[PDB]
């Protein structure tokens, strides 16, 4: 549980936003790239695994699941790369609802930034700190600290 993350790719302003969700907490990290490629996804995963103890990643599609560059980065970082098939059907809708909510947050900040990448990182900040009771940033730290102890 503590080490499982889900990759998700969504589109806005002709660009791609790559998102990693920590499944147990809903904490996210995201980046803007011009298009999804194996190389961009592999670099994103290397960044993520240097920051949090990433044991398993459910990939967002079969191209990233197949990608030799993505498999190389998973090997390097000690990540088990898995498929992202919603064997649990509530999962299509949950990723749908996350993208919808992100895009909403991005729309609420979009005027405070010239470049979409800034607005996405403002949205990551707002999402991770939202209490709506703990925030996602609090939950992930509690989860992993409980795991270590």
Sites of contact with a second copy (CB under 8 A): 29, 43, 46-47, 49-53, 76-77, 112, 117-118, 121-122, 124-125, 128, 134, 137-138, 141-142, 144-146, 148-149
- Give the angle 102-19-50 at the CA atoms, nearest 5°: 135
CB 73 within 8 A of CB 59: no
Site for ligand CIW in 90-109 (CB under 6 A): 94-95, 97-98, 101-102
Report in angstroms how near the CB of residue 92 gets to a second copy at its nearest: 26
CB 57 within 8 A of CB 79: yes
Site map 22..51 versus ligand CIW, x via CB under 6 A:
-x--x-x-----------------------
Report in angstroms how near the CB of residue 131 gets to ligand CIW at its nearest: 13
Q: Which of the listed partners (ligand CIW, a second copy, none) does 121 bind, with a CB threshold of 5 to 8 Å by partner kind?
A: a second copy
Q: How far apart are CA 48 and CA 105, in angstroms?
A: 22
Identify the helix (H) or strand (E) that includes residue 71: helix 68-77
**Residue 12 lies near ligand CIW (rule: CB under 6 A):** no
Q: How far apart are CA 148 and CA 106, in angstroms?
A: 34
- From residue 3, give the alpha-carbon distance in Å to each of 19, 69, 80, 94: 16, 21, 10, 19
**Residue 83 lies near ligand CIW (rule: CB under 6 A):** no
Q: Which of the listed partners (ligand CIW, a second copy, none) does 95 bind, with a CB threshold of 5 to 8 Å by partner kind?
A: ligand CIW
């Amino acid at each position: 549980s503590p080490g499982i993350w889900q990759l998700d790719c969504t589109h806005l302003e002709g660009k791609v936003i790559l998102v990693a969700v920590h499944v147990a907490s809903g904490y996210i990290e995201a980046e803007v790239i011009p298009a999804e490629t194996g190389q961009e996804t592999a670099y994103f995963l290397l960044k993520l695994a240097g920051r949090w103890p990433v044991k398993t990643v459910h990939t967002d599609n079969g191209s990233n699941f197949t990608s030799t560059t993505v498999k190389a980065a998973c090997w390097w970082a000690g990540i088990k790369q898995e498929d992202g098939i919603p064997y649990n059907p509530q999962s299509q809708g949950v990723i749908e609802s996350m993208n919808k909510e992100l895009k909403k947050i991005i729309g609420q900040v979009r005027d405070q930034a010239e470049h979409l990448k800034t607005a996405v990182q403002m949205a990551v900040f707002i999402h991770n700190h939202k209490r709506k009771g703990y925030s996602a940033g609090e939950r992930i730290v509690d989860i992993i600290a409980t795991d270590i102890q």
